[PDB]
Amino acid sequence: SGAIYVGNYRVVNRHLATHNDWANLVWEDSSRDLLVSSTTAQGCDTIARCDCQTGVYYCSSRRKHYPVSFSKPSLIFVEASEYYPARYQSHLMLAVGHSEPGDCGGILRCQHGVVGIVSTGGNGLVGFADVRDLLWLDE
Numbered sequence: 381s382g383a384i385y386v387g388n389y390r391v392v393n394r395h396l397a398t399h400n401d402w403a404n405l406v407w408e409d410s411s412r413d414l415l416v417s418s419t420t421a422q423g424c425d426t427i428a429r430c431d432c433q434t435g436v437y438y439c440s441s442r443r444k445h446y447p448v449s450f451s452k453p454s455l456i457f458v459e460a461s462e463y464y465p466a467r468y469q470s471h472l473m474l475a476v477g478h479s480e481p482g483d484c485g486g487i488l489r490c491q492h493g494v495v496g497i498v499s500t501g502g503n504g505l506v507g508f509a510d511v512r513d514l515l516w517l518d519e
């Protein structure tokens with residue numbers, strides 16, 4: 381679990397969005413596993429606007445942060461799950477690191493701000509949904 385709070389927006393994994401997220405929907409994209417909903421309170425986070433390929437992410441299944449080198453946002457095949465059919469997920473960045481299903485939502489940050497959130501994993505892999513291209517999140 382986890383979310384980004386920026387301005388009057390809440391960014392979450394689309395597969396973990398609540399009834400309230402869908403009732404306050406701003407934008408969603410199944411191909412990216414992202415959903416953004418509106419909030420009444422002002423958010424705590426800053427979004428990075430950069431091309432960093434190193435950063436640190438929070439891994440809830442270890443209660444720890446880990447440094448990572450990650451690939452540029454790209455179209456990557458993701459196997460079928462209970463949430464989606466087998467498909468290409470876009471704007472996804474892979475890295476070597478520990479991740480388990482419940483780790484989705486952990487934030488990845490670089491020196492400039494929030495880069496994205498955990499969205500996929502594998503045997504010693506962790507994948508992040510990029511948010512740096514969503515310029516409208518901070519107008």
Ligand SMILES: Cc1ccc2c(ccn2CC(=O)N2CCC[C@H](C(N)=O)C2)c1
Nearest residue numbers: 413458461479480481499500501502503
């Ligand atoms: C070994 C292992 C296996 C599965 C793992 C992990 C770490 C996370 N997941 C779940 C995962 O990747 N899913 C399920 C939820 C929806 C995701 C998506 N963006 O399509 C794909 C680690």
Ligand SMILES: [Zn+2]
Nearest residue numbers: 430432490492
């Ligand atoms: Zn950066």
